[PDB]
Write a protein that binds this DNA or RNA. Structure first.
Ligand SMILES: [Mg+2]
Ligand SMILES: [Mg+2]
Ligand SMILES: [Mg+2]
Ligand SMILES: [Mg+2]
Ligand SMILES: [Mg+2]
Ligand SMILES: [Mg+2]
Ligand SMILES: [Mg+2]
Ligand SMILES: [Mg+2]
Ligand SMILES: [Mg+2]
Ligand SMILES: [Mg+2]
Ligand SMILES: [Mg+2]
Ligand SMILES: [Mg+2]
Ligand SMILES: [Mg+2]
Ligand SMILES: [Mg+2]
Ligand SMILES: [Mg+2]
Ligand SMILES: [Mg+2]
Ligand SMILES: [Mg+2]
Ligand SMILES: [Mg+2]
Ligand SMILES: [Mg+2]
Ligand SMILES: [Mg+2]
Ligand SMILES: [Mg+2]
Ligand SMILES: [Mg+2]
Lengths: 70, 68
RNA sequence: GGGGCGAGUAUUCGCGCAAGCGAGAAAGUUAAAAGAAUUGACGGAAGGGCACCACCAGGCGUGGAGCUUGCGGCUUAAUUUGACUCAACACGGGGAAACUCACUAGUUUAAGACAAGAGUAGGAUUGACAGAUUAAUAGCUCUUUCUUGAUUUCUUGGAUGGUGAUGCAUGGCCGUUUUUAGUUCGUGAAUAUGAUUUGUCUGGUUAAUUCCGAUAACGAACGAGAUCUUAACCUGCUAAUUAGCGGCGAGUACACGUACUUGCUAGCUUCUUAGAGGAACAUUGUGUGUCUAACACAAGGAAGUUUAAGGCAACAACAGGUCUGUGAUGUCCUUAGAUGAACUAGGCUGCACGCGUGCUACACUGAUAUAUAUAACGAGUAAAAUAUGCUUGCAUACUUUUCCUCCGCCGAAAGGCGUAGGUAAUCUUUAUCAAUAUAUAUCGUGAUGGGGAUAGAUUAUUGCAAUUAUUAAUCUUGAACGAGGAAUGCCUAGUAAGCAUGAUUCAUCAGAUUGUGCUGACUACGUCCCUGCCCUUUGUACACA
């Protein structure tokens, strides 16, 4: 019936922070000691589905398989 | 408003008025509203019966002429 | 004499004791005042008629008490909203725990067509474990950092949805006047202006402008009637299943055929079912009436108030109700912090009080307990649920189950467990699925063994969820009420009243509607006194009447 009362500003939406060419941080190759994986690879996903190197665990963004670091 | 246009002979009550009359309703969307259309036709003394046979009218008592 | 007010007013003169009389303006303001007819509406005017939503003679009540339910008012964060004489108030099929939902407090979502510009494969955008954070297992948001692949995202237009406003912008449908008995047309006549009359009527008669008849009218049409559905009669016709009866055997007991059980299956239609026909015309006798139209009584007959009950419903209207039934709709609002669509909790039910519809009673023509006998209309079968491999989840038969449920067992009871039949004249279940009734005993005029409100405790079932107590079961508690003031409702025969039951809603809940049957009265066979509606004459300065 009345117009609203807005005392608190809006809840903000979720943006996704952007990294340019993040894949070049996943593999690096020297002259000797050829290509070396820097993150690690999954277990039930087709090869090349890498997983996050978190503070204390590894997380697969596609199947959500969690392995605890220890 | 309403406008009526008639011609001839028409019946309203009873069981004959449901047999010998044909009725429809339609509407037309004009720019400024809706109009209703309503048509009613009495058939030329032509109606089969519930025990199907060509009937005539429940209101008539013609008396035949003697043979001479 | 020269539109209406101002006004026979102001000033002046003549006459009069006075009251007053006789001559008599202007400024300003106004679109009509005024005459006579016609149709309607109204009347505390005169006549005539109809009707248990009027009365008379009566029945039963309601209004008074407890409680169930709808409406005002108060209260609240919110107690969502339409309708207010008949013709709003158990109405919106409106019995809301969630949903419904329209209201209150919060939080998500895009399920934002299409066009143009931007942004971008060196990535437009999508999703999410763990910790925090949230009622929340909404990655809602944050930290952290993987996944995804052009589906989306940002800007301006433009659409779409809305139980948002307007029923006084409309369609359709419904209610009411009115279930009354009304409404119109051709030609002729009144005209010798007109609105408009007559036909359509003094009288008798009918449920009825239904008929007879009188007549400046003669004829026609709608409405009434006819028609349609159900009920009542038929030992006559046509039929025999998923209906009956009968016929033939074997028994169990009695009396010298009767009752019941059972296997089988000449013929028949009384009982059951359902198709076609018939039957009432006021027939006959007696009376009243113009001896017309009709009415009353008796006999016969299943039936003689058109035999009973319903459905249909003319011309003309209402600013009657509904946009909260609708992918019926015009206009106005709103459209990403939505008035769209959802998810969580709350409210619609809140209680000094006023009003309508009802349920239960105030006892002995009863209450309690046993026993006997006895109805009619009905209904019924994409999801979740029961069973191997795996760590509360997955893959599995849509092979069982979901509606009415006989029967057996368990339990004081409510109910639980196991198993039939049935998509139905076949089973539930109906040669019977109820309660008023009837019989016998106890109580004994004592707010009493009448009444059963209000409270305490425990137990089951529906459901994801029962707290403000869904419903049901047991024991305990035991209020007002002793026939209802002024007022006022319905009703004429298988009717009133009393008594129970099937369906609608329905996961669960009827003190409500809508049908059905059972027991079955008193009083009238009229009238215009009150109320309402209609017609004639009459008056009118009314016409939104
Ligand atoms: Mg009729
Ligand atoms: Mg003048
Ligand atoms: Mg006048
Ligand atoms: Mg009355
Ligand atoms: Mg009386
Ligand atoms: Mg009573
Ligand atoms: Mg009362
Ligand atoms: Mg009510
Ligand atoms: Mg209310
Ligand atoms: Mg309820
Ligand atoms: Mg709508
Ligand atoms: Mg209206
Ligand atoms: Mg309308
Ligand atoms: Mg006339
Ligand atoms: Mg028979
Ligand atoms: Mg609508
Ligand atoms: Mg809700
Ligand atoms: Mg309510
Ligand atoms: Mg007592
Ligand atoms: Mg008692
Ligand atoms: Mg109801
Ligand atoms: Mg009277």
């Amino acid at each position: 019936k009345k117009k609203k009362v807005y005392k608190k500003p809006k809840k903000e939406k979720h943006k996704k922070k952007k990294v340019k060419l993040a894949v070049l941080k996943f593999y690096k190759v020297g002259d000797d000691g050829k290509v070396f994986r820097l993150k690690r690879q999954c277990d039930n996903c087709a090869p090349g589905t890498l997983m996050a190197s978190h503070f204390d665990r590894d997380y697969c963004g596609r199947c959500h398989l969690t392995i605890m670091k220890k | 408003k309403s406008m009526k246009f008639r011609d001839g002979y028409l019946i309203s009550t009873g069981e004959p008025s449901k047999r010998f009359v044909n009725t429809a309703t339609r509407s037309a969307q004009l720019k400024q509203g809706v109009l209703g259309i309503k048509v009613k036709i009495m058939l030329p003394t032509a109606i089969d019966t519930r025990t199907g046979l060509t009937s005539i009218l429940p209101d008539n008592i013609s008396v035949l002429e003697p043979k001479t």
